[PDB]
């Protein structure tokens, strides 16, 4: 190929890979907060009714 083509195709390539990692990583951590909050409430809620 041409030098210009190959560097343009390398700069595109890693941009997708970093981007795929950011986008997946956001979903994991966005769900990890919903999970934190829920599970903390559940553990209390079960037990506060027992103390009652």
């Amino acid at each position: 190929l041409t030098p210009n083509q190959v560097n343009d195709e390398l700069n595109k390539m890693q941009a997708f890979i970093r981007k795929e990692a950011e986008e997946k990583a956001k979903e994991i951590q966005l769900k990890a907060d919903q999970e934190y909050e829920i599970e903390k409430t559940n553990i209390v809620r079960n037990e506060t009714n027992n103390i009652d």
């Binding site: 190929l1 083509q5 595109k12 390539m13 941009a15």
Partner: protein, 392 residues
């Protein structure tokens, strides 16, 4: 080049990175080049700047392009059928509905003011739901327009059968609009009336024979109540028992009896059938012409929603970053498409490939090969930069 041309303008939708510069005019501006240089300045440029959307991951991205191609082609086809249903109805004859308003704004004027429509399609929603919503709307609308045009064609067929029954050709026809209390007697049961469908030659032959066909045939009843080109339609009154002898005797002479009595319910129901059939075709046709026109606009807004989406996502796949692109809709005057397409390829082609590039022109549609179809779901011939060709 064309695919359903009337007098509609043809459009090329292009998108580029914001670092791109033409090589055909070095150091020139992209926006200026499109209006000024491009096919001798007879190029009319309109805005068509598509917003950012929620782009998936890398694996999901392949699957997003595959579906945009398919859905695009469906909507494009389906609209082609709607135009046809109109063309046949004579609601599109010289020109109509390819330049006609699209919510009170003509088709070329509408594309320039088209930038994304926030009618129900949101940018706080996912890409996936945008493809599913738009495509569902497009399919569903086509199916209702198709169901009414089928029903209308059936309805014409019933009416046509009915008019001929009410007068035309005798072979199934019994008259019901030319009744009279004395040319058609049945009030007790002694007398009845038999009608005889007689060829024209045979008209004299009937006037002579009518009395002899059976015994107890009423005098001077034989008169032509109705007449058509092939046949003359007679009434004769006679006694009910004798109707069997009469009919058989009629068929030897080489007449054809048509049996109709003057029962009240008979006369009324045949008459009704003519009327009910005209009223069904009538109501339907008015709703059906209205329904297609209303469908036409909706599937138009929806076709462009996919293309805008399609082009955007593709741009992301081919150039990479920036996610901010310089996007235009260029109105080409009819038959300058091939010359326009080539000029764009020379300038901008280097960006998407310095070896993956060849000269090309126009748009040819085929099922001979899959090459030259410019799509990301089937193998085609790779374009050197993102360019999609719209034929109206």
């Amino acid at each position: 080049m064309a695919t359903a041309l009337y007098t509609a303008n043809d459009f090329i939708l292009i998108s580029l990175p914001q670092n791109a510069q033409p090589v055909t005019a070095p150091g020139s501006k992209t926006d200026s080049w499109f209006n000024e240089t491009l096919i001798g300045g007879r190029a009319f440029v309109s805005d068509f700047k598509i917003p950012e959307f929620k782009i998936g991951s890398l694996d999901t991205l392949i699957v997003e392009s595959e579906e945009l191609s398919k859905v695009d082609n469906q909507i494009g086809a389906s609209i082609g059928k709607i135009i046809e249903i109109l063309q046949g109805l004579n609601e599109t004859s010289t020109n109509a509905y390819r330049t006609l308003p699209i919510n009170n704004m003509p088709v070329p004027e509408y594309l320039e003011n088209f930038q994304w429509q926030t009618r129900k399609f949101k940018l706080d929603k996912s890409i996936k739901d945008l493809i599913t919503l738009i495509s569902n709307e497009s399919s569903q609308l086509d199916a209702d327009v198709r169901a009414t045009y089928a029903n209308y064609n059936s309805a014409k067929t019933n009416l046509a059968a009915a008019e001929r029954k009410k007068t035309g050709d005798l072979s199934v026809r019994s008259l019901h609009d030319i009744v009279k209390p004395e040319d058609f007697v049945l009030n007790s049961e002694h007398l009845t009336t038999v009608l005889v469908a007689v060829p024209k030659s045979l008209k004299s032959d009937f006037e002579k024979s009518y009395e002899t066909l059976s015994k107890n045939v009423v005098p001077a009843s034989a008169s032509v109540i109705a007449e058509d080109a092939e046949y003359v339609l007679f009434n004769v009154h006679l006694f009910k028992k004798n109707v069997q002898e009469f009919t058989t005797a009629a068929r030897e002479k080489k007449f054809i009896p048509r049996e109709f009595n003057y029962s009240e319910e008979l006369i009324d129901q045949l008459k009704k059938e003519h009327d009910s059939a005209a009223s069904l075709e009538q109501s339907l046709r008015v709703q059906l012409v209205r329904l297609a026109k209303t469908a036409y606009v909706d599937v138009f807004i929806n076709w462009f929603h996919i293309k805008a989406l399609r082009v955007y996502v593709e741009s992301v796949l081919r150039y990479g970053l920036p996610p901010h692109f310089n996007i235009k809709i260029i109105a080409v005057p009819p038959k300058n498409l091939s010359k326009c397409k080539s000029e764009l390829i020379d300038a901008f082609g280097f960006l998407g490939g310095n070896a993956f590039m060849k000269d090309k022109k126009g748009k040819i549609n085929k099922q001979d090969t899959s090459l030259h179809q410019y799509a990301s779901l089937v193998d085609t011939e790779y374009e050197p930069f993102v360019m999609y060709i719209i034929n109206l």
